[PDB]
PDB file of C-alpha atoms and ligand atoms in Angstrom:
ATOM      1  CA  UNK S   1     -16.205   1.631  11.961  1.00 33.08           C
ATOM      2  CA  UNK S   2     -17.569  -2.273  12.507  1.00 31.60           C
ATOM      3  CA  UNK S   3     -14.352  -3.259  11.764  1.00 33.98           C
ATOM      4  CA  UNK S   4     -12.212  -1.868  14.435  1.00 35.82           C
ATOM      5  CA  UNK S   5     -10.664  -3.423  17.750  1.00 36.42           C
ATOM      6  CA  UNK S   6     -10.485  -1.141  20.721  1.00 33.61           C
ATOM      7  CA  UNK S   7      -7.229  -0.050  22.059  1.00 34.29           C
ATOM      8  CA  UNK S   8      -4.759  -0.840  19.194  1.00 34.97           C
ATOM      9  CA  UNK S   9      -1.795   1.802  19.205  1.00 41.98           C
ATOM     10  CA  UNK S  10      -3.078   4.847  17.245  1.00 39.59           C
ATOM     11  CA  UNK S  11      -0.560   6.687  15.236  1.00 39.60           C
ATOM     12  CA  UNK S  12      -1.034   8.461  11.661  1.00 37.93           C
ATOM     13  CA  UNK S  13       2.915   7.174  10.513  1.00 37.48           C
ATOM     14  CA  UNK S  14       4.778   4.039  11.785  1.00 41.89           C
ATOM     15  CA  UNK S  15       8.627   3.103  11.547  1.00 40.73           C
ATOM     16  CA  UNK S  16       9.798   0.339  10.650  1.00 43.26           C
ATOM     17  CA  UNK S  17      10.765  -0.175  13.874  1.00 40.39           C
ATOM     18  CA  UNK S  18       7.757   0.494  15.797  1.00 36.75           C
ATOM     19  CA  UNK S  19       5.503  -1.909  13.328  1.00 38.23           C
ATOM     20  CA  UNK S  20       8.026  -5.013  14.307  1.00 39.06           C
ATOM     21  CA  UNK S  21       7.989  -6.300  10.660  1.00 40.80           C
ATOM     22  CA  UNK S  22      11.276  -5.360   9.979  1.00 41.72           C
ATOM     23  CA  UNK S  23      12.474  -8.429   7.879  1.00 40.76           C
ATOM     24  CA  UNK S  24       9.354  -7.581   5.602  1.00 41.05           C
ATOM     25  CA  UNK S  25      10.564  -3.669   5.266  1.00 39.85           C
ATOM     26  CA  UNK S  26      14.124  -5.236   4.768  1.00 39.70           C
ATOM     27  CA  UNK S  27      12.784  -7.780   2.181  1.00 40.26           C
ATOM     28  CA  UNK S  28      10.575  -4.625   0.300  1.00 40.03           C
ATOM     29  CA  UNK S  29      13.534  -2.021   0.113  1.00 38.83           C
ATOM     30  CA  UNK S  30      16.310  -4.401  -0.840  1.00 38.37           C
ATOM     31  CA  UNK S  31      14.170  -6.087  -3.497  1.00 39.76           C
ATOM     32  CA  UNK S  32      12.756  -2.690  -4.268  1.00 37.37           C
ATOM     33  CA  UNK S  33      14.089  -2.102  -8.496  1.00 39.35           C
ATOM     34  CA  UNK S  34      13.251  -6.519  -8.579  1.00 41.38           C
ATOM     35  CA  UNK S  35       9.957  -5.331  -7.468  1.00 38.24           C
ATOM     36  CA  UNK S  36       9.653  -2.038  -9.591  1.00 36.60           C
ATOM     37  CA  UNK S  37      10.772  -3.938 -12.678  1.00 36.75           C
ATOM     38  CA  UNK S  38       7.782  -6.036 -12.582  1.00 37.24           C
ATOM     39  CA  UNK S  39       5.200  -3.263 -11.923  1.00 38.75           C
ATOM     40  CA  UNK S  40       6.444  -1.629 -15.037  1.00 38.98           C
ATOM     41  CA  UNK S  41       6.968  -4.868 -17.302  1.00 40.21           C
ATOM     42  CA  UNK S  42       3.209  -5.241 -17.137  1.00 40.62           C
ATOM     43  CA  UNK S  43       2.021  -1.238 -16.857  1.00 41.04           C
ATOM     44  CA  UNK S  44       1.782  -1.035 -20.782  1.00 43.48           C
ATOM     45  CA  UNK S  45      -1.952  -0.003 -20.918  1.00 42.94           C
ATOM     46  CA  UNK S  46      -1.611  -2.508 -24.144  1.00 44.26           C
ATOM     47  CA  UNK S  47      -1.218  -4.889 -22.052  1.00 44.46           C
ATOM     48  CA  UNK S  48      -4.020  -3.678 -19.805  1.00 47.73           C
ATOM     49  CA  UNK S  49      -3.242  -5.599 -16.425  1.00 50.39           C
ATOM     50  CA  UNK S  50      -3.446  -2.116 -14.468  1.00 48.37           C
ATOM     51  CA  UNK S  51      -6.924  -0.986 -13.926  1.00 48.47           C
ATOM     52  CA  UNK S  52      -8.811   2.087 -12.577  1.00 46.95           C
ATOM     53  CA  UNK S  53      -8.536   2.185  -8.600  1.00 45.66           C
ATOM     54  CA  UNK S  54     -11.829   2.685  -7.436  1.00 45.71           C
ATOM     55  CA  UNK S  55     -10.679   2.619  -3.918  1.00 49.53           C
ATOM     56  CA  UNK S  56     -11.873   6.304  -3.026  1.00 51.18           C
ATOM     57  CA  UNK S  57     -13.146   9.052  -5.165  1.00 51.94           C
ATOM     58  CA  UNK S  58     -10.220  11.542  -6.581  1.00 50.94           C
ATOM     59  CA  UNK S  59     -11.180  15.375  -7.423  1.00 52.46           C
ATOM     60  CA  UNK S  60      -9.340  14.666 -10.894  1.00 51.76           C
ATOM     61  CA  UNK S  61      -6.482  13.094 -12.412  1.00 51.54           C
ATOM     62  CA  UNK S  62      -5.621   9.027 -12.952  1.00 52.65           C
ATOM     63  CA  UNK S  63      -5.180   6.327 -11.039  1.00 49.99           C
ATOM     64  CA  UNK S  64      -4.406   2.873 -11.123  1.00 50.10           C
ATOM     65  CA  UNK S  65      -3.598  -0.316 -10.052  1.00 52.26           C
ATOM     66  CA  UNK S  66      -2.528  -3.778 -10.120  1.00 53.80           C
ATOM     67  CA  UNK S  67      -3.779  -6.238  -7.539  1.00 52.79           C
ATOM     68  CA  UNK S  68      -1.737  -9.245  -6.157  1.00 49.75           C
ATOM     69  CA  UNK S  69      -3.496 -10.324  -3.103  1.00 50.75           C
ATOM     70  CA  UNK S  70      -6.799  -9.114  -1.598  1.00 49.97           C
ATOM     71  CA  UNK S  71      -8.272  -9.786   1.435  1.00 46.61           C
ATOM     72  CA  UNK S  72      -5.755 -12.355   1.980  1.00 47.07           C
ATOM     73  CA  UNK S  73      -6.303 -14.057  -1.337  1.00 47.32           C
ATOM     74  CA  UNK S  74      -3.591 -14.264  -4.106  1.00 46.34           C
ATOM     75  CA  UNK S  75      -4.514 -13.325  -7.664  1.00 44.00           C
ATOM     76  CA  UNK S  76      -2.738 -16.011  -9.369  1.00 42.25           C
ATOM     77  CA  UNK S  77      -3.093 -14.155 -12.795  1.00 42.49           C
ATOM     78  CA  UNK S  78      -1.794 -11.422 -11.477  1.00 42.48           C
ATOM     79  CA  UNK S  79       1.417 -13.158 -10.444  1.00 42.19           C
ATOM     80  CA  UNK S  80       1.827 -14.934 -12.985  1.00 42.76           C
ATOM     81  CA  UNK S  81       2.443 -10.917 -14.347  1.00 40.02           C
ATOM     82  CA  UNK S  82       4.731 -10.342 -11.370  1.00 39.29           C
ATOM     83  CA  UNK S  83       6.091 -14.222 -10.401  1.00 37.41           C
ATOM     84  CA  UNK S  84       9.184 -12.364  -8.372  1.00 35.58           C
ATOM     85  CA  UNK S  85       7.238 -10.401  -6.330  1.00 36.53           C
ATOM     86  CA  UNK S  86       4.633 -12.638  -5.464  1.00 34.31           C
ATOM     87  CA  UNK S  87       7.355 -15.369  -4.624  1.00 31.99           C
ATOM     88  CA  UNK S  88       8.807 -12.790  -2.245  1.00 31.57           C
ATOM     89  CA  UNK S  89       5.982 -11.710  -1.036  1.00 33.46           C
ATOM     90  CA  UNK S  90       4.834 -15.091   0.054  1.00 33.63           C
ATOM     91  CA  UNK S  91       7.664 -15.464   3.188  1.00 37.28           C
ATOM     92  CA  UNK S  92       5.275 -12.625   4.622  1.00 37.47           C
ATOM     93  CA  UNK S  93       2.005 -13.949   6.045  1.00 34.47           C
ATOM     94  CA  UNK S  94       1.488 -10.732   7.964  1.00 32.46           C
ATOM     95  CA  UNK S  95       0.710  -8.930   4.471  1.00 36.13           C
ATOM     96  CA  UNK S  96      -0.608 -12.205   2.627  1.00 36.94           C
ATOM     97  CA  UNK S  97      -2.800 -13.593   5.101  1.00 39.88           C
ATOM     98  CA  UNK S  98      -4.244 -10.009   6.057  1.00 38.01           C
ATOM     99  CA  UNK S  99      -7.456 -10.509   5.261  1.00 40.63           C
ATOM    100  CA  UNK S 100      -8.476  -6.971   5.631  1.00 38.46           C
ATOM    101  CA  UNK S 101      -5.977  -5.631   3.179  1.00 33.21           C
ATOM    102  CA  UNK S 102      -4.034  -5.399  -0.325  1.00 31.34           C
ATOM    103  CA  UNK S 103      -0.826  -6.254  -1.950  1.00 34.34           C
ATOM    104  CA  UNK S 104      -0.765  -3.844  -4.966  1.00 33.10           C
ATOM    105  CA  UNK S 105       1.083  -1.905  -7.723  1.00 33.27           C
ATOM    106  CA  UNK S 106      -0.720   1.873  -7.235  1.00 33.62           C
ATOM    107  CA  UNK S 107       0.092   4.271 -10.550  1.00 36.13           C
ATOM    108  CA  UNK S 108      -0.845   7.764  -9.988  1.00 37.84           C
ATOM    109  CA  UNK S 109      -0.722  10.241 -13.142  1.00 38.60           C
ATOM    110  CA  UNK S 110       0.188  13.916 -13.201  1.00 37.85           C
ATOM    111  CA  UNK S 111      -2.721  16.539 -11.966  1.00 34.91           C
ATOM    112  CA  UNK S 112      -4.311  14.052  -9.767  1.00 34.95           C
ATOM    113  CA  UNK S 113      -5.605  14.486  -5.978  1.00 37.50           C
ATOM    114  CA  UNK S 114      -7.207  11.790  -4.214  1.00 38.48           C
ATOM    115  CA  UNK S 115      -9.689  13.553  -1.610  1.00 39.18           C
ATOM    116  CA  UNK S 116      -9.205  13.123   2.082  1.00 35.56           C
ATOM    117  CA  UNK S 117     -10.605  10.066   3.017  1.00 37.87           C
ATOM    118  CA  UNK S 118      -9.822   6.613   5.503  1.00 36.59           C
ATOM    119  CA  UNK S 119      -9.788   3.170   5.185  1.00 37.19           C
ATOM    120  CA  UNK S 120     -12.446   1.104   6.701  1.00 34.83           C
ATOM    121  CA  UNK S 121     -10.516  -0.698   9.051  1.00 35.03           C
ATOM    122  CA  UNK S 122      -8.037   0.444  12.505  1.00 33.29           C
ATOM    123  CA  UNK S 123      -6.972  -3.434  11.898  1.00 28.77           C
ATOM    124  CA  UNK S 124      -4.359  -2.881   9.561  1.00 27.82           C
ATOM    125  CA  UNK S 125      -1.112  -0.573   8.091  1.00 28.12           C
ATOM    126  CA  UNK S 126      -0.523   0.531   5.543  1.00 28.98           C
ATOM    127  CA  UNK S 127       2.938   0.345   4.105  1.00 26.47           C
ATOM    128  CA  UNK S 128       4.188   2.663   0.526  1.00 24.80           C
ATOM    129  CA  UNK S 129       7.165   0.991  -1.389  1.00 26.42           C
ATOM    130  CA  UNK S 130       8.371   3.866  -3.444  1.00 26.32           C
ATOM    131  CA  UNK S 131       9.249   2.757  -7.339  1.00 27.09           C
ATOM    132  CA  UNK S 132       9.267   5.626  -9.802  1.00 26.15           C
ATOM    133  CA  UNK S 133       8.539   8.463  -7.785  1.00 24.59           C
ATOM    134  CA  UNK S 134       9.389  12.081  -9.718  1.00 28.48           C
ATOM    135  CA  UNK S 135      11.679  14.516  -8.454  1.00 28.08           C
ATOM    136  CA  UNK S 136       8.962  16.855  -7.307  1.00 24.00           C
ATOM    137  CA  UNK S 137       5.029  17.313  -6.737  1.00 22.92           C
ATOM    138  CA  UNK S 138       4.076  14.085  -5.274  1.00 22.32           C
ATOM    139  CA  UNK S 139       2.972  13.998  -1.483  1.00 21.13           C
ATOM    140  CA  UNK S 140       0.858  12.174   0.901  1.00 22.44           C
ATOM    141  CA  UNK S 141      -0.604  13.936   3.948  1.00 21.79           C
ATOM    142  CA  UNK S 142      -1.756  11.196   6.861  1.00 23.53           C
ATOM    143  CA  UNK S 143      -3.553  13.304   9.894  1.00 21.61           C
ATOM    144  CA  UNK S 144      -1.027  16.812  10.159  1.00 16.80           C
ATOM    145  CA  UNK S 145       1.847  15.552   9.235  1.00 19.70           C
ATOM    146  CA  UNK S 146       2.743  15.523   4.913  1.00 18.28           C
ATOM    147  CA  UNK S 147       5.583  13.505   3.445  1.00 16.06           C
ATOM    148  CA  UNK S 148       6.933  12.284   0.413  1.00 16.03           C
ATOM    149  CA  UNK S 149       8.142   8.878  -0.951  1.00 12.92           C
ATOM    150  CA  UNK S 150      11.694   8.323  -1.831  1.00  9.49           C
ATOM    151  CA  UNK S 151      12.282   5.063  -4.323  1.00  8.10           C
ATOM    152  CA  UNK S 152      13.360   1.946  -2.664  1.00  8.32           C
ATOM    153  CA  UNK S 153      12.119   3.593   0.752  1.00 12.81           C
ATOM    154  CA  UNK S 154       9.160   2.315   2.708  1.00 13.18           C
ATOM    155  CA  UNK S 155       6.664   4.333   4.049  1.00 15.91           C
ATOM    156  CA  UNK S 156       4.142   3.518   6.478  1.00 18.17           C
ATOM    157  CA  UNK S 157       0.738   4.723   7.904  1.00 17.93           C
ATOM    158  CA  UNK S 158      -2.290   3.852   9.538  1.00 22.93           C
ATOM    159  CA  UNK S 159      -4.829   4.565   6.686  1.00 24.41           C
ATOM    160  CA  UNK S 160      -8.154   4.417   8.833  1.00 22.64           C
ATOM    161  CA  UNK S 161      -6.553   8.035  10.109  1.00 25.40           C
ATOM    162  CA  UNK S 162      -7.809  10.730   7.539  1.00 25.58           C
ATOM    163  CA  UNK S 163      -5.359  11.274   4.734  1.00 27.66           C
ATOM    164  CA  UNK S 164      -5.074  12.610   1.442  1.00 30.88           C
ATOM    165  CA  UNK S 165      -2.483  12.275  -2.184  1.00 29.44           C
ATOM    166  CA  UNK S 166      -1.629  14.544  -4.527  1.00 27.76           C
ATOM    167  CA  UNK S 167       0.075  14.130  -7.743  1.00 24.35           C
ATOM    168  CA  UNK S 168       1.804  17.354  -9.001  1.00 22.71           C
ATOM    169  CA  UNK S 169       4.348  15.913 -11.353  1.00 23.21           C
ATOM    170  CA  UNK S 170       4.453  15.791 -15.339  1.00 23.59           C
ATOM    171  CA  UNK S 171       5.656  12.606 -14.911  1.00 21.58           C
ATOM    172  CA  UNK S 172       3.852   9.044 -13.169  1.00 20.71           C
ATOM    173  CA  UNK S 173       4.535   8.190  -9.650  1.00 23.07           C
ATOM    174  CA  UNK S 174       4.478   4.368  -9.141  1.00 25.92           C
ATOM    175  CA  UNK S 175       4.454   2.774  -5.596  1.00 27.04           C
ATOM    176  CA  UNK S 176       4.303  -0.869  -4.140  1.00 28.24           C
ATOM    177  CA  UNK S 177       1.520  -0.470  -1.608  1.00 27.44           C
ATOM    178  CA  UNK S 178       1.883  -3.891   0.749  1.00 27.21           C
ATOM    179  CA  UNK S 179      -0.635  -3.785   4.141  1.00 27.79           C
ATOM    180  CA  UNK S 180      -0.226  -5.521   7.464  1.00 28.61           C
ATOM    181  CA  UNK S 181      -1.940  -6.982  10.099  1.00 28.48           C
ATOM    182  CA  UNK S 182      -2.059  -3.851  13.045  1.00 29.55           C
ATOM    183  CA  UNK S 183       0.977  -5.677  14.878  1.00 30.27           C
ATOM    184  CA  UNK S 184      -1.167  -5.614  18.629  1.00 26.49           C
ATOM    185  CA  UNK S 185      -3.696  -7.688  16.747  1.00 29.16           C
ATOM    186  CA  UNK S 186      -3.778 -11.565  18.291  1.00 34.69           C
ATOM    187  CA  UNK S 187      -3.237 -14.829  15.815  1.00 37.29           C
ATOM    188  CA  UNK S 188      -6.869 -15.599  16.906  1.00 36.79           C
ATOM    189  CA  UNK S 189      -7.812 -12.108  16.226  1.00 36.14           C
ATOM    190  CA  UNK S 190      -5.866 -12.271  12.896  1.00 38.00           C
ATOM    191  CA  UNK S 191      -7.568 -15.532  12.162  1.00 36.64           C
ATOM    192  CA  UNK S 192     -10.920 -14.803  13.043  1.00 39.20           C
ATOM    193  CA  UNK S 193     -11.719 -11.138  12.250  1.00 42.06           C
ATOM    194  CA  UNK S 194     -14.105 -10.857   8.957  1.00 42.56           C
ATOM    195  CA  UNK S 195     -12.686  -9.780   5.678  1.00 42.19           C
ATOM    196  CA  UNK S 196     -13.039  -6.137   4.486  1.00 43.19           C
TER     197      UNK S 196
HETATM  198 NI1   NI P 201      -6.366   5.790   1.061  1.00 44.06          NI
END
């Protein structure tokens, strides 16, 4: 891709641990029903604040989301539909100031399958806050290795590695999806490098 830096650790999932934002991870799991409550306060389609994602084509199914920073930008109508979050949220300039990622609510619906696919960028991770996330049928593959989300449990992956959702539930699986700088990546580097 044009927007990758050479050398950064290469891994399809990340702990915690390993990513060294650890007070962010804290922050997202024990704030993680503060942070669902908001996501489904404004998912009434009545309302209408959660939109179609776009982000990659999906063999069938629905998906959607609700955007609270992009590119490193804050969507200040957006917060003011989830003030909480977005207050929390903004203690963590490695997720608001990445300028090549998102800060979003992500809905998927029942008999959807997002096909395999990557990001555009080695430059960031992606972390999966789970919300409402139904007993069985929802999965995420990342490279060869499949998992599921548990709610108020982060996930994380490197999302320029191939990987691939499905949503075999009745029921809607809603996760916080919150990205991050790649954590080798220099403050110049994180300063300078072109939004994508
Ligand atoms: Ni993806």
């Amino acid at each position: 891709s044009l927007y990758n830096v050479n050398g950064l650790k290469a891994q399809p999932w990340w702990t915690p641990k390993e990513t060294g934002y650890t007070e962010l991870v804290k922050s997202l799991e024990r704030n993680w029903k503060l942070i669902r409550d908001e996501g489904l306060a404004v998912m009434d389609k009545a309302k209408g604040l959660f939109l179609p994602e776009d982000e990659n084509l999906r063999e069938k199914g629905d998906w959607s989301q609700f955007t609270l920073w992009q590119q490193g930008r804050r969507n200040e109508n957006a917060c003011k539909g989830a003030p909480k979050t977005c207050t929390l949220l903004e203690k963590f300039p490695e997720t608001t100031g990445c300028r090549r990622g998102q800060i979003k609510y992500s809905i998927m619906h029942p008999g959807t399958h997002v096909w395999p696919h990557t990001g555009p960028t080695n430059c960031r991770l992606r972390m999966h806050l789970g919300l409402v996330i139904p007993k069985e049928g929802c999965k995420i593959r990342c490279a060869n290795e499949t998992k599921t989300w548990e709610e108020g449990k982060v996930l994380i992956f490197d999302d320029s590695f191939e990987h691939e959702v499905w949503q075999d539930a009745s029921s809607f699986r809603l996760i916080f999806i919150v990205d991050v700088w790649h954590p080798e990546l220099t403050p110049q580097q994180r300063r300078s490098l072109p939004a994508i």
